[PDB]
Scaffold this active site. Structure first.
Site, PDB file in Angstrom:
ATOM      1  N   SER C  49     -29.263  84.188 -27.316  1.00 32.81           N
ATOM      2  CA  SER C  49     -29.533  82.684 -27.368  1.00 32.81           C
ATOM      3  C   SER C  49     -30.362  82.168 -26.212  1.00 32.81           C
ATOM      4  O   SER C  49     -30.607  80.929 -26.155  1.00 32.81           O
ATOM      5  CB  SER C  49     -28.279  81.813 -27.450  1.00 32.81           C
ATOM      6  OG  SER C  49     -27.384  81.924 -26.346  1.00 32.81           O
ATOM      7  N   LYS C  92     -23.629  73.188 -26.216  1.00 37.63           N
ATOM      8  CA  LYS C  92     -24.785  73.257 -25.439  1.00 37.63           C
ATOM      9  C   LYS C  92     -25.318  71.872 -25.219  1.00 37.63           C
ATOM     10  O   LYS C  92     -25.642  71.464 -24.074  1.00 37.63           O
ATOM     11  CB  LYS C  92     -25.822  74.135 -26.085  1.00 37.63           C
ATOM     12  CG  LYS C  92     -25.293  75.631 -25.942  1.00 37.63           C
ATOM     13  CD  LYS C  92     -25.898  76.560 -26.963  1.00 37.63           C
ATOM     14  CE  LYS C  92     -25.585  78.061 -26.624  1.00 37.63           C
ATOM     15  NZ  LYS C  92     -26.389  78.857 -27.553  1.00 37.63           N
TER      16      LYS C  92
HETATM   17  C1  LIG Z   1     -26.392  82.849 -26.469  1.00 38.06           C
HETATM   18  O1  LIG Z   1     -26.522  83.919 -27.171  1.00 38.06           O
HETATM   19  C2  LIG Z   1     -25.304  82.595 -25.390  1.00 38.06           C
HETATM   20  C3  LIG Z   1     -25.887  82.165 -24.020  1.00 38.06           C
HETATM   21  O2  LIG Z   1     -24.758  81.660 -23.313  1.00 38.06           O
HETATM   22  C4  LIG Z   1     -26.347  83.369 -23.165  1.00 38.06           C
HETATM   23  C5  LIG Z   1     -27.055  82.877 -21.894  1.00 38.06           C
HETATM   24  C6  LIG Z   1     -27.344  84.243 -23.904  1.00 38.06           C
HETATM   25  N1  LIG Z   1     -24.351  83.685 -25.216  1.00 38.06           N
HETATM   26  C7  LIG Z   1     -23.175  83.278 -25.517  1.00 38.06           C
HETATM   27  O3  LIG Z   1     -22.081  83.990 -25.629  1.00 38.06           O
HETATM   28  C8  LIG Z   1     -23.004  81.805 -25.710  1.00 38.06           C
HETATM   29  C9  LIG Z   1     -22.065  81.470 -26.862  1.00 38.06           C
HETATM   30  C10 LIG Z   1     -24.488  81.428 -25.886  1.00 38.06           C
HETATM   31  O4  LIG Z   1     -24.681  81.247 -27.245  1.00 38.06           O
END
Ligand SMILES: *C(=O)[C@]1([C@@H](O)C(C)C)NC(=O)[C@H](C)[C@@H]1O
Ligand SMILES: *C(=O)[C@]1([C@@H](O)C(C)C)NC(=O)[C@H](C)[C@@H]1O
Lengths: 594, 133, 133, 129
Positions: C49, C92
């Protein structure tokens, strides 16, 4: 080649669907001739045997039906006799003779039995000694008696604990004597057959003690910690044949003991499938009527054809009679007691509904654009590769696979493999594809390109070589700037020579791309390209075969990776005019860019 | 032969000879025989059933065959898949950079099979890549 | 590289490299080294993400392009540069509002997010009011 | 519904008077009480209590043994009996994962009833709620 409806249709024509079937009960091993012949040997020779094969084949039922047809001379009476106040032995006397000894014995408050010499003497010396100077633990103890050996003793003990196998001592308060000993399955099986499951022996920890019984004749009734003393039990000669039952994987642990194959010299292996022939269709029908089903011809035919699809083979049917029966039992409810073609086809549908949540979530997310897919149009360096997600019942789905090419020094990068999502077989498929690519395109020296391949939105581990052909077409498309059809998904493994190879779960793959095409609106030109070597595993569901018959979905079978690319790119490899030229021009552009 | 007669077998010359020659093949040596008398006896015991009590050359050769049948499922599946083209092999013709290499699959009784082995060569800097390795 | 990023996060970086390499081909190989860090992150991070935010930051650093710091970004990106759905969308959004709020709203703050998440926006009242205002 | 799937709760218990033991001192478990009707158990209790194999045996083989004590000089043999009940097991996808690698689970529990984590946001589900 295009697969016509006529080429794909595999189901059995049904005449007079509703007429009741009447057929005789087949023999216990129909379609299992290997096992039958191995067990005929073990019975004729007195060997112990093991019955090995997948769950739900009905090994136990078949074996109990077979042994019920055998005959042996009437087994002897079996008994424990005391040899002392602290010693006992297991003895045989001719059938019916124990009741006569026990009475001769009881009429000794205050010859006929040559076999009983050891105990008779021990009995006198105790009479002598009480004269010479109650406790009335000097009588025989009858363990079993039998009135015929047709059928022979058949003891199936599914729960192989030590007290169930070897018997139990009771204490009266301690006191203990020969009269309080109870028999186990070993005793009850004397002169006949003992059937045990391999997994129970292991789970209960009784393999070593059972070895000792078979090897050394030691069969000890189970005892208690508290008891000041206990009885010695003499070994006895074992007279029984053991049949062990289990899966290939239940046997693996027992097989690293040398003593297993010394003691179980007959392997009776059941095959997971048998020939799909009219004689096995007929045996299946008689086997079903003998289970009590009200079967009709249409119902027997659909069950038979669903056993073929369960085997994923047009020529073979799945041998697991227990599974066919379970499905028939759900069909019966739905047809009100009557097993018809509808009720079978509706039982099937209901099972698919009952495990369809994951797929409903999936198709919803595609419809919403949360999973991004294309099922129409053309795109460079992209293709619907088809996948099966780890988990029963293993639905198939398209996964968008992309490939990008840039000037660089021959590197074929699988992103999922580099990120640790790809297994060893998947990795192998990528290296194979690099071997093919390097060796086809040699004119510039080393491949002047870096190619990266990703399964978009895959978040789980993927293994298998079944995405190789889709990775290869995507890679040649990205090199050559060749727009590919997004209405045809692809599946197939490829070897270094560019030959397409067989893949597993072919029906799931196909049908799962139909479901996605269907959920987004069929365009008329969607379809799948798959290996010619899987033709015999296509046993497609009705809805797909209908679509193919209506011209609304299309199956292509290919032998080489170049034939797949020609279909997806809509042009021949040669001509001028041709794909090979465009790939040349592509590589030369990269080569200059370097 | 004397050890077998003392075990109680009814042995004939042809039966002793085939047992002896099957002990040589079990050793995989023309000059040596396998010393495991318990194994020779187990095979002789299955031979005896098949010859009705008499250990003959046929009954020994038929005991052997039956043991091979009884562990032959994996191989029957294999040969079926080659026949159907699900495993792709060649047993005729010529081909560049390919050969039937022969292998034994991990598992008793260890049947042998051909595996198609391919090699591709391209311009590059001395690298011999084993894909499986 | 420091071991804080998981496999899915790693995958997102390699995807982004695949996109970057293939868009900017005129010079041959990308004549640049690009390093990306989450400042003051001390824990493991996983997921794809952050891909779109890594990609915009990378094109900004190449092109010397000043970026708005009043708009936070979320989204995954595939090799073709398409933005993909991400999880926890309402969290977010609202968490960037809370930070903007705690430091004083300037009037021009906001979030850029995937069109494919429109149907997952069920924002809390305070954010919907700010957007309305 | 027996949420606590221990062997004495499922299969019943022998009492001893001081031993003595007889048919009159046997107490029933949930299996007995559920005869001609429905027994509801949680998948996680079967696993935690270690009673899955013995419960298999009850359903497969009809063996339902009341629980016994180490001390007792002897004990009663209990004949199997034909089981007349339907079992409903309840749990999460992850409570089922361990039970699902046993072939016997899906042989014995042929109906999967899977509840969806969400439903349509419609005026009829607003009304039902
Ligand atoms: C996205 O995939 C994500 C971001 O916090 C990081 C920085 C990639 N990962 C997660 O577990 C959370 C839920 C975010 O969606
Ligand atoms: C093919 O080998 C396969 C594909 O799903 C992946 C993408 C390679 N792997 C599998 O386990 C399933 C059964 C597919 O065949």
């Amino acid at each position: 080649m295009r697969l016509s409806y006529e080429a794909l249709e595999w189901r059995t024509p049904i005449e007079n669907s509703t007429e009741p079937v009447s057929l005789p009960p087949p023999p216990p091993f129909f379609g299992q001739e290997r096992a039958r012949e191995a067990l005929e040997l073990a019975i004729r020779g007195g060997f112990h045997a093991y019955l090995v094969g997948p769950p739900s084949l009905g090994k136990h039922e078949a074996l109990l039906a077979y042994l019920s047809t055998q005959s042996v001379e009437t087994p002897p009476d079996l008994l424990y006799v005391p040899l002392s106040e602290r010693k006992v032995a297991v003895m045989t006397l001719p059938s019916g003779q124990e009741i006569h000894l026990a009475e001769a014995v009881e009429g000794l408050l205050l010859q006929r039995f040559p076999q009983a010499r050891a105990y008779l003497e021990a009995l006198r010396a105790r009479l002598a000694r009480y004269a010479e100077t109650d406790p009335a633990q000097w009588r025989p103890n009858l363990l079993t008696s039998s009135s015929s050996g047709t059928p022979p003793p058949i003891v199936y003990e599914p729960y192989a604990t030590a007290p169930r196998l070897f018997g139990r001592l009771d204490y009266l308060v301690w006191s203990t004597n020969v009269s309080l000993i109870r028999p186990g399955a070993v005793h009850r099986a004397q002169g006949g057959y003992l059937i045990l499951d391999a997994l129970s022996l292991k789970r209960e920890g009784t393999w070593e003690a059972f070895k000792r019984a078979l090897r050394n004749g030691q069969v000890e009734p189970v005892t208690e910690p508290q008891a000041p003393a206990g009885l010695e039990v003499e070994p006895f000669p074992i007279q029984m044949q053991v049949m062990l039952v289990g899966t290939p994987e239940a046997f693996e642990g027992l097989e690293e003991d040398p003593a297993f194959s010394e003691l179980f010299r007959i392997r009776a292996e059941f095959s997971p499938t048998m020939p799909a022939s009219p004689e096995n269709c007929t045996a299946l029908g008689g086997w079903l009527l003998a289970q009590g089903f009200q079967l009709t011809q249409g119902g027997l035919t659909r069950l038979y054809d669903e056993a073929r699809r369960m085997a994923e083979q047009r020529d073979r049917m799945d041998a697991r009679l227990v599974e066919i029966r379970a499905l028939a039992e759900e069909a019966a409810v739905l047809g009100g007691g009557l097993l018809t073609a509808e009720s079978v086809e509706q039982a099937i549908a209901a099972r698919e509904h009952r495990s369809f949540l994951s797929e409903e979530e999936f198709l919803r997310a595609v419809q919403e654009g949360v999973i991004r897919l294309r099922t129409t149009g053309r795109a460079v360096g992209e293709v619907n590769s088809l996948v099966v997600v780890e988990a029963a019942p293993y639905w198939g789905r398209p996964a968008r696979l992309t490939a990008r090419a840039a000037p660089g020094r021959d590197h074929l990068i699988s992103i999922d493999r580099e990120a640790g999502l790809g297994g060893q077989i998947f990795h192998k498929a990528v290296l194979t594809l690099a071997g093919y690519l390097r060796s086809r395109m040699i004119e510039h020296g080393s491949l002047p390109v870096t190619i990266s391949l990703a399964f978009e939105q895959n978040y789980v581990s993927i293994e298998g070589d079944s995405a190789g052909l889709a990775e290869l077409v995507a890679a040649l498309s990205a090199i050559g700037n060749l727009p590919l059809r997004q209405d045809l998904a692809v599946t197939g493994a490829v070897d270094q020579t560019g030959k397409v190879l067989a893949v597993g779960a072919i029906n799931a793959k196909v049908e799962g791309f139909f479901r996605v095409c269907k959920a987004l609106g069929l365009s008329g030109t969607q379809g799948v390209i798959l290996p010619e070597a899987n033709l015999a595993n296509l046993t497609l569901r009705a809805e797909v075969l209908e679509a193919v018959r209506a011209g609304q979905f299309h199956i292509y079978a290919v032998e080489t990776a170049e034939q797949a690319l020609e279909i997806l790119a809509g042009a021949r490899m040669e001509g001028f005019r041709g794909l090979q030229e465009k790939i040349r021009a592509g590589l030369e552009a990269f080569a200059r860019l370097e």
